[PDB]
């Protein structure tokens, strides 16, 4: 029916009957579960933080302010902030944020960006210009040289 082991330092270990699941309760309040599929779930008592390691290389952190950070095996990092904005950082330096209101911000490592507003407008920033595109077909652009351009809708 399983076993409980208590060590002289106060750390306790519980083993399932099939020995597949192990739970370790450390003397400092930390708790570690090792699951049959080899997922390791570690709870830091003082920091109130959970760190989960998956056998495929993925790692997930859950912070007590309800922030979650996911690290994919490729290097990708995905943050869900308390507000539920999702920000993805790619190893190349690209960053993408998907806001709850619907806004999307794409930032390139060269510093260029594309912003998609929940209002249906789109903004593009490059080394040569900042451009705003409107749902009615209007395009407005300011160039690095200071000139401003409005392209009117065909209709």
């Amino acid at each position: 029916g399983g076993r409980l082991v208590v060590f002289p330092n106060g750390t306790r270990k519980e083993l399932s009957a099939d020995g597949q699941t192990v739970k370790v309760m450390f003397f400092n309040g930390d708790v570690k579960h090792t699951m049959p599929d080899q997922r390791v779930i570690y709870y830091y008592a003082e920091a109130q933080t959970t760190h989960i390691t998956y056998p495929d290389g993925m790692e997930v952190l859950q912070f007590p302010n309800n922030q979650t950070e996911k690290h994919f095996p490729d290097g990708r990092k995905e943050i869900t902030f308390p507000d539920q904005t999702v920000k993805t950082l790619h190893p190349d330096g690209r960053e993408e944020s998907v806001l709850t209101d619907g806004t999307i911000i794409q930032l390139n490592p060269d510093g260029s960006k594309v912003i998609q507003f929940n209002t249906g407008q789109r903004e593009i920033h490059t080394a040569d210009f900042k451009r705003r595109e409107y749902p009615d077909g209007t395009v407005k652009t300011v160039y690095s040289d200071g000139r401003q351009e409005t392209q009117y809708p065909t209709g």
């Binding site: 750390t11 450390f26 003397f27 400092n28 570690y42 830091y44 003082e46 920091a47």
Partner: peptide, 12 residues
Amino acid sequence: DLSPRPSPNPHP
């Protein structure tokens, strides 16, 4: 025996 992982945050 068994010892926990080091705390991520510095002690107060």
